[PDB]
Symmetry: C3
């Protein structure tokens, strides 16, 4: 019960499905807590599903919850998340749902209730105030090394 971690943050969670464990970090230091599937789902190759996790959270104002795929499933069976990283807003009070998708070309993926199918990170976010300018120069911003370079401008692959 002693906070060693004084400024570590408290995430209210409702287990909409009390049958599932509370999400937890696999190892100390891990960035996310793993989310369970509340249901059994089979995804044929290329199919997607919106899977309930059985939890609702209250991400603090000034923060964001981020739903990330797990790496093992991604490589072993081609499981991904369509909208990755899923963006859980501070005001959301609904059930977190995971948009799983099977990116394997031939093997279906079976998800069982109680499987760990994603991980939830919480991070700060900047709640930005847009300042519309006619040009960056007019806003007095110094030019930058990057400039308008994008889309592979730095090279690093034959196709770029």
């Amino acid at each position: 019960g002693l906070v060693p971690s004084h400024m570590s943050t408290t995430l209210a969670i409702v287990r909409l499905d009390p049958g599932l464990p509370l999400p937890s970090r696999a190892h100390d230091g891990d960035a996310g807590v793993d989310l369970y599937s509340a249901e059994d789902v089979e995804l044929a190759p290329g199919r997607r599903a919106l899977v309930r996790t059985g939890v609702a959270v209250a991400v603090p104002f000034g923060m964001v919850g981020l739903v990330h795929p797990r790496s093992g499933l991604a490589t072993r069976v081609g499981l991904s998340i369509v909208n990755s990283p899923g963006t859980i807003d501070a005001g959301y009070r609904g059930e977190i749902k995971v948009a799983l998708i099977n990116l394997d070309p031939a093997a279906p993926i079976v998800v069982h209730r109680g499987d760990r199918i994603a991980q939830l990170l919480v991070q700060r976010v900047e709640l930005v105030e847009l300042v519309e300018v006619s040009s960056f120069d007019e806003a007095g911003l110094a030019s930058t090394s990057r400039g308008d370079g994008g889309a592979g401008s730095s090279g690093g692959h034959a196709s770029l």
Copy 2:
């Protein structure tokens, strides 16, 4: 006009396409502002497109802009973003472009100019200074619970 939010950050934006609304948060607290498509795009199943948003921003030095898919489109029509999360560097002064892709196997996705097709988050990032070491032990780092465990090492699915 009164800043209630004293340390909230200001994002210079140029509407390269003045016909589109400024990106905005759907709800108070939302992590991102939605980006519009400046153009009409149809994506057949499996096709991708680099779609202009009509905006350029100046992400502050020490921050990153992150282009995330919207969840509704992801589930309803299989819209995703190839390079999600798109990484907008602080020095970039070009147009934000969104690499949309249709991950549905059969139904095309029609995007109209003025549709909200992604969301932009701004977060701090650590501008890391690499310190090359011959080993972590030699750097005097304590071993960790995780160690070299990865790629599903904690289990949580039959395939792992």
Copy 3:
């Protein structure tokens, strides 16, 4: 050698493959350092591979490493990362591996050893303490504008 950047963070790195350059930022201010492939890989359409980068890092406790696709490859050849954003935990001391996938329907992607195939960001993360509540109301949280709205509730596309 003078720190202009006083509070900028130090990332221990082991070049497991000393033949590859240390990851670097393409431009000042860039959010990530580019990761190299340590190996030659060809991905037929729809195939994925777990590619070694030749590096191990020690992400600081209270932080996360994030493996993001590069935008140029994503658009030019449909390269993506299955588990994007890859989540490198602070305790991980193994090799960073990148789950590349070819989302192009017809053209294979050839990766050569020494190509820059992803970028690594480091960010703070909140190591959340879950507080289970029976309801948010019972936790005394004010209702929110968003409520349980999700999954396209704000509209912005014909399909929503």
